[PDB]
Amino acid sequence: APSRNGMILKPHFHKDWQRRVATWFNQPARKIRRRKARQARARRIAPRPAAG
Amino acid sequence: NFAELKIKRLRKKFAQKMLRKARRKLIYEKAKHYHKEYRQMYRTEIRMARMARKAGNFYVPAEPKLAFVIRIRGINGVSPKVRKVLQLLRLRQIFNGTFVKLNKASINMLRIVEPYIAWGYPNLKSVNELIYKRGYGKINKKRIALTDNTLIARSLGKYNIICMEDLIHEIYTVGKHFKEANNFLWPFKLSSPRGGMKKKTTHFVEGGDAGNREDQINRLIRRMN
Amino acid sequence: PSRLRKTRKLRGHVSHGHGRIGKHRKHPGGRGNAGGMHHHRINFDKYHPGYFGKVGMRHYHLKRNQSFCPTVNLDKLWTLVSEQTRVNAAKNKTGAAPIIDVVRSGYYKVLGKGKLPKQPVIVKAKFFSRRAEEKIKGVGGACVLVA
Amino acid sequence: ACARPLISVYSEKGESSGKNVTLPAVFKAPIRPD
Amino acid sequence: GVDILHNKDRKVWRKEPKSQDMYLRLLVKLYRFLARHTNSTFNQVVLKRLFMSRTKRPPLSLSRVIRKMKLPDRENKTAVVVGTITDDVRVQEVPKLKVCALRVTSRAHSRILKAEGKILTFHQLALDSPKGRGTVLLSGPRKGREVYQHFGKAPGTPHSHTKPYVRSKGRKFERARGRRASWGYKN
Amino acid sequence: MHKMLNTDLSRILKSPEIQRALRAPRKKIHRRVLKKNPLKNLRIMLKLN
Amino acid sequence: AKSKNHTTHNQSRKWHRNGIKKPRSQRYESLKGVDPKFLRNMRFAKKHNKKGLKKMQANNAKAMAARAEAIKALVVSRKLHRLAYIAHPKLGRRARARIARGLR
Amino acid sequence: PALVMSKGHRIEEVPELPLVVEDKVEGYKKTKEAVLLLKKLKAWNDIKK
Amino acid sequence: SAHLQWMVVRNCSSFLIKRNKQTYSTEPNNLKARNSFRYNGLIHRKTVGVEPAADGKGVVVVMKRRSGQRKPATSYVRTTINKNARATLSSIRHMIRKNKYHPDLRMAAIRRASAILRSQKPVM
RNA sequence: GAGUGGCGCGGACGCUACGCCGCGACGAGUAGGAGGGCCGCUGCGGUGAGCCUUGAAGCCUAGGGCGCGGGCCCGGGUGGAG
RNA sequence: CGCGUCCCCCGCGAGCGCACGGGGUCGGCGGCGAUGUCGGCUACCCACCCGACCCGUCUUGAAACACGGACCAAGGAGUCUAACACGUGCGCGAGUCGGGGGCUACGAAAGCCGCCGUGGCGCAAUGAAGGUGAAGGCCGGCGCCGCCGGCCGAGGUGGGAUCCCGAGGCCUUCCAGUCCGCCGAGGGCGCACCACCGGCCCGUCUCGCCCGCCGCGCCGGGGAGGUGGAGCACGAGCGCACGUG
């Protein structure tokens, strides 16, 4: 119930959203993995440009 | 070489001493002149009354200029119009007293609070003991006790009220600067009446203590002061 | 910080700052934006006038890239080009005007808000306001269009 | 103040080498515990 | 029993800053002293302003200090701002000014010192003028914040030109029933 | 940037620049003073009248 | 389950807490609601005040010129009164200096 | 050193507060060399603490 | 400066010890041993210390020199005074007043020195 | 206020300026609000050259006390590793 | 209560001392003290006088013949996330922010990028939309001209904390006479902010002429006066943290 002058606002939280909450504790582990797989690719192409 | 500083700083010290003595003499002579005035005021009211009786006429004396209003009823269950007037008279507490000058605008403010106040026409001696014993000056919005004249000379001296006696003269003989000298006084924190009240609730005329006690406020000031 | 919060001070009370008479019940006005035309009409009228009803034309596959037209006012026109150009133009005798490509700095339409300092300009904009053009001409300048 | 004094460099035996560094301006930055 | 209302007996102003920053809190010690000891009412106003919130001492633009020191009988005078001095990019010529500010923005410093100007801090202003003589004390606009557009008479209440709190502005975000004669009524 | 450049407000406040432009310190302490009566204390009465 | 219908009982007490504010009677009230045909003309009367600026500014000097010649061609007891004169610092310095010299 | 001592660092014997040592110290490989250096700089009573 | 690094140290120093509604400073050159701007012994350019001797007998008076103040190992110049009470207290009075060296610690230093001399005196 | 003219080597206390001092008035309180806690619990970063098998925590206590109170500190008993 | 001087009516003397004098001192004393005595306020028990109904709760009203509670231990109830608003703290400031990506034990941290600001939010609004999109005056070339140029050029009134000038004046057996400072009649520039009055932008309506031109048109642009706008009128925002709703 609206108190006084405030923003009229509609949260999209009516579905079972807590089953599908993607957290990002992977983030630094992902970045380490992508960087190791990028260095590992760059070493396989010995003379060739690493970027592609 | 200091001999001139030493001598100069002693002359300044001395110039303020002779200046005190001159003020101390003025304050002495002002009070001596006031003693002469109160004699003549008291004696003329007799003199006028007598020559009227000698003729076989009447001398109706002046309706009094100066009342001493004491609050006799407490803070609980008071009408809004009565609340407002009692706090315009600075009677915000039971057995608080203020000097009020009588005119048409004041007497209709004292009938509007009649049940809640006991007022009269205070004596000269009533104005003395109230200003001496109970006299607290409102100095920098603070209730400070009138222990030296220079408390009264620093607030009221611009109205030529430079001592205790000048204040008493300005109240009793309702002067041109009565308003400022009376607002300078804090409302008098009086004690409960010793020997008791007759009856708080009812008016003085019907054997109570509320309303106008013309000569008779001075019996209760001496009781409460 | 849970220790700075109000809940800590309300240990030992009873109602927890929510009323002894009108209990803290769950949803006693309905949930969310419920009753905006009924029991909450005055809030939605006093504070949100226009909330209910249709107005204007639908535009189905609106693409915000088409209507993209970032605007620069004349008052900040000389910030697009280095302060060296503003100095050296006023010094140099030729009457030669430095070119301000409004599109390079990342604006399309030149609007005419402020006083423009009295030296010639060649503003290469995509669009111009009328007043924007008049000022550039008035100072003694050109308005080049571009695409 | 503004001034940056002359900071000495100590040898492995804990005694002052002839070499000096001018105190970097970082060490005269404002101290904010806030 | 005294009939007093204690509702307003506590005055709700600042005795000190809410901040724990020491450099401000040393400038307060300096102006605690100067305010009460000097007879100058300037130092009272500076001390009072060192207490005030970020929002109560808003930023004064270079161009207002240009403008408010262009005023007659104000030449060779120090512009005192208890807030911060921001650079104004839509001003070309900047004269030589004497400025006191808690903060001057790096672009405004450059701009003032290039025009043969001088920048003081409150510590220097004390040593330069203890009683704050030969000063123009200025303030930034306090109704500058967007916050103040939402304040006053509620929108949907006739002759209120008060910005509503709308999620996002468009042609179907609070334009209908309380806004037009067509869609019911207009305030 | 520094909010103040001379943090030493020992040296600031006792500088002649500032020490010139003060009023004198009111270091004399004034405790309350007891009321004495009209008719009771004779020389308290003589101090007023 | 009948209840109380209407009262105005505590209301006069509630109104007087934050005072009953008389409206903030500011000077120069707005010209809203003043008749359009008159408000049109008054706006024109303000628009053309530039016209009679020279006629007005020169006429201010002629009112000052009348005043330039109008300033040019213009040019209780005995003891208490005496003791009040001696008592107060400024006017009674010499009266008190003689009391100090009188006791030599 | 006012603030470094207030942090509790035993630095009484320490020659200068922004203690700066040679670039030879980078080339140290044994802890025997590192421990010996702190005895000479007189930072060791900070480790002993 | 002193006034700045007081505003850092005033509450959060290692030498600071709050308990039993009392505040103390265990700093190696504070004479009244109390958390105070004046008495703090790390923060000023001029500092008077008074400690008992390296032996059992006498008082050491720690003057902090004017010059190397980023230089802790040479900043404090210590002088042992092992004399009779009246002359130990006199030397400290002369050091502080007649060098003008932090002359508002003149009496705290004497009272401390007096209480150290009392301490290293055999019990009855 | 300032410039040219007519012997004995001495003096309490203070000012954690977020401190210290002075003077005045005042003090009901539900729902409720706000503030300050050197009130208390558990963990983390710092810190106290902290404490502790010459006895930690816990517990008991007609013991000695402190604080307006939340609480806390000491004594004595028990206990055995924080 | 010296007198050197002024005319109507006829600038510092030295001591001492007493105190109804800016909140109590005594330069007065006397008892008692080792196995029965002293102190210990609080705490343990007991007695007596006065007061004194049982808490929680809903309630106009509870000791209620209203409900819950036999007793004790331990557990046990405004949380976290998202959004928003306002307040506050900090950084930078017409900007601001890497948060995604990338580069280089604690470290899954921290540091760095700038041709990684893509992008967000702010810097411009207004209209349903096509769209349009935020000061002018004066002096001349042809008492009034479409446009030639010329120069100063972002309002006005009122109240406004602060500052500015300073008629006069604040003392040494005099009187000139500066420099330093300070007070002040009166006079000003006036911050923010408030009210009012103008102006400008957008929509819309009314009246009304006059410009423009690669395509002279059911074209384009301008004016005056009302009116709708969440505008302009020498920026305040952004990020972060905390509080409250």
Swiss-Prot record, chain B:
Keywords: Acetylation, Cytoplasm, Phosphoprotein, Repeat, Ribonucleoprotein, Ribosomal protein, RNA-binding. GO terms for molecular function: RNA binding; structural constituent of ribosome. It is found in: Cytoplasm. The keyword Acetylation applies. Belongs to the universal ribosomal protein uL30 family. Its main location: cytoplasm. PROSITE patterns: RIBOSOMAL_L30. The modification N6-acetyllysine is found at residue 101. Component of the large ribosomal subunit. The ribosome is a large ribonucleoprotein complex responsible for the synthesis of proteins in the cell. Binds to G-rich structures in 28S rRNA and in mRNAs. Plays a regulatory role in the translation apparatus; inhibits cell-free translation of mRNAs. One of its GO terms (biological process) is maturation of LSU-rRNA from tricistronic rRNA transcript (SSU-rRNA, 5.8S rRNA, LSU-rRNA). It comes from the Eukaryota. It comes from Oryctolagus cuniculus. This is Large ribosomal subunit protein uL30. One of its GO terms (cellular component) is cytosolic large ribosomal subunit. The modification Phosphotyrosine is found at residue 116. The modification N6-succinyllysine is found at residue 104. NCBIfam families: uL30_euk. Component of the large ribosomal subunit. Homodimer. Interacts with DHX33. The lineage of its organism: Eukaryota, Metazoa, Chordata, Craniata, Vertebrata. The keyword Phosphoprotein applies.
Swiss-Prot record, chain G:
It is found in: Cytoplasm. Component of the large ribosomal subunit. The ribosome is a large ribonucleoprotein complex responsible for the synthesis of proteins in the cell. It comes from the Eukaryota. Belongs to the eukaryotic ribosomal protein eL29 family. The modification N6-acetyllysine is found at residue 32. Component of the large ribosomal subunit. The gene is RPL29. The modification N6-methyllysine is found at residue 4. The modification Phosphoserine is found at residue 30. This is Large ribosomal subunit protein eL29. Residues 1-32 are annotated as: Disordered. Coiled coil: none annotated. Residues 1-25 have a biased composition (Basic residues).
UniProtKB/Swiss-Prot annotation, chain H:
It comes from the Eukaryota. It is found in: Cytoplasm. Citrullinated by PADI4. Component of the large ribosomal subunit. May bind IPO9 with low affinity. Interacts with RBM3. Belongs to the universal ribosomal protein uL4 family. Component of the large ribosomal subunit. The ribosome is a large ribonucleoprotein complex responsible for the synthesis of proteins in the cell. This is Large ribosomal subunit protein uL4. It comes from Oryctolagus cuniculus.
Swiss-Prot record, chain I:
The modification Phosphoserine is found at residue 114. One of its GO terms (cellular component) is cytoplasm. GO terms for biological process: translation. The modification N-acetylserine is found at residue 1. Keywords: Acetylation, Cytoplasm, Isopeptide bond, Phosphoprotein, Ribonucleoprotein, Ribosomal protein, Ubl conjugation. It is found in: Cytoplasm. The keyword Ubl conjugation applies. GO terms for molecular function: structural constituent of ribosome. InterPro entries: Ribosomal_eL28, Ribosomal_eL28/Mak16. Its main location: cytoplasm. There is a cross-link at residues 57, 64 (Glycyl lysine isopeptide (Lys-Gly) (interchain with G-Cter in SUMO2)). Disulfide bonds: none annotated. Component of the large ribosomal subunit. Belongs to the eukaryotic ribosomal protein eL28 family. This is Large ribosomal subunit protein eL28. The gene is RPL28.
